[PDB]
């Protein structure tokens, strides 16, 4: 019954050829050793 | 007594940067800075030494020539 309603309602979808595996491949994610220190001596607790 | 500071500091890892090429980066501007700021200081250190030395050689030469028959 869930499959039948999905077939009935989800009809006007984009069907764009863009695929997620190609997106991550052309714009990969890499790690860079680095740090950001936001010094604020008015806060009672430090969080890192 | 501790200071109370508020600032944001971003730092990059030493293993992500070139270590040595910055020594010869914009070399001409470095020399320009060193001579521009310090030429008065170098003159106040070099002129008395060289001037007093030159006079002493000038004195000794003349005194050596007056005693010569």
Q: CB A36 to CB B10 under 8 A? A: yes
For residue B7, which residues of chain A lie inside 8 Å, CB to CB? Answer: 39
Q: Are the CB atoms for A20 and B4 separated by under 8 Å?
A: no
- 8 Å CB contact of B13 and A33: yes
Name the nearest CA neighbour of A38 among B6, B18, B21, B3: B6
- Tally of helices (H runs) and strands (E runs) in chain B: 1, 1
CA distance B46 to A41: 50
Residues 6+ apart with CB under 8 A from B10: A34, A35, A36, A37
**Cα dist. A17→A7, A10, A23, A24, A28 in Å?**
20, 18, 11, 15, 19
Kindly report the three-state secondary structure assignment for every residue of B25-54. Answer: CCHHHHHHHHHHHHHHHHHHHHHHHHHHHH
Which experimental method was this entry solved with?
cryo-EM
Instruction: Judge whether B12 is closer than 8 Å to chain A, CB to CB.
Output: yes
For this entry, resolution in Å reads 2.8
| Partner-chain contact B16 A32, CB within 8 Å | yes
B24 vs B30: CA distance, rounded Å: 9
Q: Which two tokens stand for residue B11?
A: 């730092």
Report the alpha-carbon distance of residue B65 to residue B69 in Å, rounded: 8
Sign of dihedral through CA atoms A13, A17, A18, A21?
positive
């Amino acid at each position: 019954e869930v499959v039948e309603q999905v077939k009935k309602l989800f009809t006007k979808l984009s069907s764009d050829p863009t695929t997620t595996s190609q997106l991550v491949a052309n714009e990969p994610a890499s790690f860079t050793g680095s740090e950001v220190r936001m010094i604020d001596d008015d806060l009672p607790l430090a969080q890192f | 007594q501790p200071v109370k500071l508020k600032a944001v500091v971003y730092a990059l890892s030493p293993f992500q940067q070139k270590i040595m090429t910055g020594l010869w980066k914009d070399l001409p501007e470095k020399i320009h800075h060193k001579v521009s700021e310090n030429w008065i200081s170098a003159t106040l250190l070099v002129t008395p030494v060289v001037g007093t030395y030159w006079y002493a050689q000038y004195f000794k030469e003349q005194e050596k020539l007056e005693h010569r028959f």
